[PDB]
């Protein structure tokens, strides 16, 4: 069934599963034409496919060339997603193929279902959580690699850097989703919080600063404060 607050700990059991977020697959800028009409221009996008237990991220880069001469691109984007996720599963050795795939948007169920027909024992699931995976392009290193790509390309990352050496998956996922929720609500403030201190660096093989344990507490508190603030502004409360 759908994934929600009740069955949240299932993400950290030993059943391999992946989240797929398609929100950054089909990205456009909207602009005016010489004649005064609106046109779009597509930029490179990415499928965000993430094992929430291990942090392994399969960042499939969607090169603008995919869209060339295609109609109904928003609808195609969902099938192209599903095609690429399916090929990702086929590429994995049997014992690594997921038992579940949780799609963050319900419109992905049928496209993925159809593309996964060869995998009847992989359960495709929706979720009721409002996960912030759309802010993934707010992670500087992920947006850089997407925007620089000149062809389709899969780039593998651990989205937890080395956190699991010291915390659990559950705590690692909660940090991840708090960082991304903040980036999503106020990117500028969020990034300020993360880099304000020049003496805390990002390792070349990491995405996030090398905070100590105490510095992460202060960070996480600052991110929570940011999120609560923005909420009263939006709603006047």
């Amino acid at each position: 069934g759908a994934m929600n607050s009740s069955n949240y700990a299932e993400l950290f059991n030993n059943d391999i599963k992946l989240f797929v977020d398609d929100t950054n697959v089909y990205r456009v800028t909207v602009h005016k034409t010489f004649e005064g009409n609106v046109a779009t221009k597509a930029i490179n996008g990415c499928i965000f496919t993430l094992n929430p237990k291990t942090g392994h991220l399969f960042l499939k880069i969607i090169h603008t060339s995919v869209w060339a001469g295609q109609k109904r691109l928003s609808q195609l984007a969902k099938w192209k997603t599903a095609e690429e996720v399916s090929a990702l599963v086929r590429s994995l050795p049997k014992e690594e193929q997921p038992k579940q795939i949780i799609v963050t948007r319900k419109a992905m169920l049928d496209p993925l279902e159809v593309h996964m027909l060869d995998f009847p024992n992989i359960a495709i699931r929706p979720t009721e959580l409002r996960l912030p995976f759309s802010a993934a392009m707010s992670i500087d290193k992920l947006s850089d690699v997407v925007m620089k790509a000149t062809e389709p390309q899969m780039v593998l990352f651990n989205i937890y850097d080395d956190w699991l050496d010291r915390i659990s998956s559950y705590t690692a996922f909660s940090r991840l989703t708090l960082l991304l929720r903040a980036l999503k609500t106020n990117e500028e403030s969020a990034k300020m919080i993360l880099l304000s201190d020049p003496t805390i660096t990002i390792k070349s093989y990491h995405l996030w600063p090398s905070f100590t344990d105490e510095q992460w507490i202060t960070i996480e508190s600052q991110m929570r404060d940011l999120i609560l603030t923005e909420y009263g502004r939006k709603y006047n409360v």
Binding site: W79, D110, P111, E113, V114, L117, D118
Partner: protein, 300 residues
């Protein structure tokens, strides 16, 4: 003109023949239905005054033999049976008619309704959906489940409709995932018409037989089947012109004939709104759409 005599009517029952029906009182001297038009299938069906559950009935064709009804006080239902002794049967039938204990199949001469609802239904096909090969007629009731239903318990009592499933390998060619799911032309025309049904008439025949089982017995899996077959056509961009015209006719008479008070369970809101308003064939069912709107604009 053919006759289906009844031995007796021991229990108070509502008897239907095709779209007609008559109330019969316990031990009323009712002894058959006469003047049944040759050339079509027919269905006799029953609903006991004391159990408005389990509507049941028998598909038959009088060209395939002499059939009569007989109440079984052990199994508790009216059973269809074949009389092989042709002389003993004309005898029974003539005597009952002389004593005028038989109702006449009440066909208005202007009325093509039954023809229209059974145009493509052929007894030989029914007997492949309802497998009971020692009898030339087929029994169906309210509660019989379909082969598709069973997969998701007794096979001898199943309705072996052709399984249609839009999210199956059968329906979807590898490499044409998106194409085939959005445009079911290949599933309809190659897989189902050319492959399984062979022609449009057997397809339309199963579709009409499913509609009738839903209407007459409230058989839920038949309704599921009738709706699937409609949707398969409406969701194909490429359908022969002759199939579309005939479909609009088929559905028109089915919608026309449905009891008005049953439209809530027999009509699937999604399929109908998708077929009539969203599908490739939105503009190809002019009569079905006109009658649906003027009779059930609520469902839409």
């Amino acid at each position: 003109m053919n006759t289906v005599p009844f031995t007796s009517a021991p229990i108070e029952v509502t008897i239907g023949i095709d779209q007609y029906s008559f109330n019969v009182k316990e031990n009323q001297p009712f002894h058959g239905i006469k003047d049944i038009p040759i050339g079509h299938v027919h269905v006799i069906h029953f609903q006991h005054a004391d159990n408005s559950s389990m509507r049941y009935g028998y598909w038959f064709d009088c060209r395939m033999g002499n059939f009569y009804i007989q109440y079984d006080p052990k199994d508790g239902l009216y059973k269809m049976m074949e009389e092989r002794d042709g002389a003993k049967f004309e005898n029974i039938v003539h005597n009952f008619k002389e004593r005028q204990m038989m109702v006449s199949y009440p066909k208005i001469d202007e009325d093509d309704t039954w023809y229209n609802l059974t145009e493509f239904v052929q007894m030989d096909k029914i007997r492949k959906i309802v497998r009971k090969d020692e009898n030339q007629f087929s029994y169906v009731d309210s509660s019989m489940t379909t082969v598709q239903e069973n997969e998701l318990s007794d096979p001898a009592h199943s309705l072996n409709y052709t399984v249609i499933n839009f999210k199956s390998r059968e329906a979807i060619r590898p490499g044409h995932e998106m194409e085939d799911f959005l445009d079911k032309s290949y599933y309809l025309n190659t897989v189902m018409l050319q492959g399984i049904f062979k022609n449009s008439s057997n397809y339309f025949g199963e579709l009409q037989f499913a509609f009738l089982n839903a209407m007459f017995f409230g058989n839920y899996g038949s309704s599921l089947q009738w709706h699937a077959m409609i949707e398969l056509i409406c969701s194909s961009a490429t359908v022969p012109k002759h199939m579309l015209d005939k479909l609009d006719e088929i559905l028109y008479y089915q919608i026309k004939t449905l009891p008005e008070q049953y439209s809530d369970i027999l009509l699937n809101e999604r399929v109908w709104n998708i077929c009539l308003y969203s599908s490739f064939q939105k503009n190809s069912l002019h009569n079905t759409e006109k009658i649906m709107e003027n009779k059930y604009p609520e469902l839409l």
